[model samples]
Target: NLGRIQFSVGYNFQESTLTVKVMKAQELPAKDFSGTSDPFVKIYLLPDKKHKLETKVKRKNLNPHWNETFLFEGFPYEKVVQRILYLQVLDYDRFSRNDPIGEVSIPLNKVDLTQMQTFWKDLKPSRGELLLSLCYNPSANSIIVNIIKARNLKAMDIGGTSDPYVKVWLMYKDKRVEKKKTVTKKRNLNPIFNESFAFDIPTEKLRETTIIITVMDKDKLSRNDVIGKIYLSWKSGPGEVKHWKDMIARPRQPVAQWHQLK
Candidate 1:
């Protein structure tokens, strides 16, 4: 909320290029003693950090306007939406290193870039999906949970993939019971975890229990990162309601579904 960047962007299909126009600024911060600052902008289309572009330095005005346009070539139509435009506003200095004023990052997939559109995007500081099945066993007095796999997991490493695992916990009255997790899979965005765990619960008392499934990124340096989570209980949404009811309606039968992690 410190500043706002006014810029224009578009993707060209035939020429295989992207156009980013760095326009102007409004209500920017002062990093100098004069109560004003010399500002400039840096641009980069991520997934490849080696190449980057920047705007000319605008001096002493908080609302300096620059209509500079930058182009990115060799970007195909299929990869256009898959990339991102990262623009950072910074304060320049001669004798010392530059200061970061703010930044704006635009994910191409979220925009309709077939035509050019100029928009003001804010500078910000800045889930995996799980495939699972649920079933109840009447004879064994157990609830069966199958953590089949996960997809599109957030990249937790510099190499663009995360070694991930899933933790399935059995909860009784919001209290933790025995927990089961899958083995860590390496160097992948999508990992298959065909692991199952069962919990002893009376058919009549199923409503009193909650089955919590959490997907996590494996970390060697310290504690693992929690990627995505799904809580199966009566208090969940309609989609969750349907999935649970379907499993309940047919005991001893596994009801499979894909849940986008919240």
Candidate 2:
């Protein structure tokens, strides 16, 4: 059977954030006597072993679908285009060391950021396929994002609820320009905060800007946990550009869209 992996990538020029998504895998060979394998993926930006992103192991499956994403901050666009994306597939083991199954290296310069591209490549020395997508968008001069509310949030506290708040950040050139947070709601899973935040960036710098929205659980003693997050950038998708154009067309009115947290 052919094994496959799917993923996507995007870059934000304003904040210099490189976003990569590992979508799924298919038809991997079983590595155990039980005729199954627990699989996970590890991603690295070449020459930068100091940081790596890994996905959770999917137990007892040859074909694992990992819809996970990761971000690398402070990396310039010019530098990233020169780096290599290293991907390694591994099988999880409980009592012993993990086993490397396959690997692939992608040249960043070969990927076009202007549109989404899906690649299906054969794994090294294996009858398997690896599939992934790449996409890029530039940023707008300014954008208005509304913090509407959240529903069906996962419980983070022992009391079957959480004190939740929404934090917004506008990042540019590896630094945060503006940071804002909504008022925390006491012990509520579904909180409403019809609040709006705006960032006034230059049109020429739109390709380098990014907006991050995070839903966090407030903790008094222990460290707070993140419930979910949403990232917006020109390279995120075509819809993002449409939204920005709509906003510019109607500056007086804001374009409202509900983003499902991830």
For lDDT, the strongest prediction is 1
Please list the residue runs of candidate 2 whose C-alpha ends up more than 4 Å from where it truly belongs after superposition.
125-262
User: Per-residue alpha-carbon lDDT of model 1 for 144-228, expressed as tens digits?
Assistant: 8998988888887777878898888888787897798889998877888888888888767688778888888788998887777
Which window of 10 residues has the lowest lDDT sum in candidate 2?
126-135
Q: How much does candidate 2 score in TM-score?
A: 0.46
Query: What C-alpha RMSD separates each model from the true structure?
Result: 18.5, 15.7
Question: Per-prediction count of colliding residue pairs?
Answer: 1, 21
Cα deviation at 260, candidate 1, in Å, is: 0.9
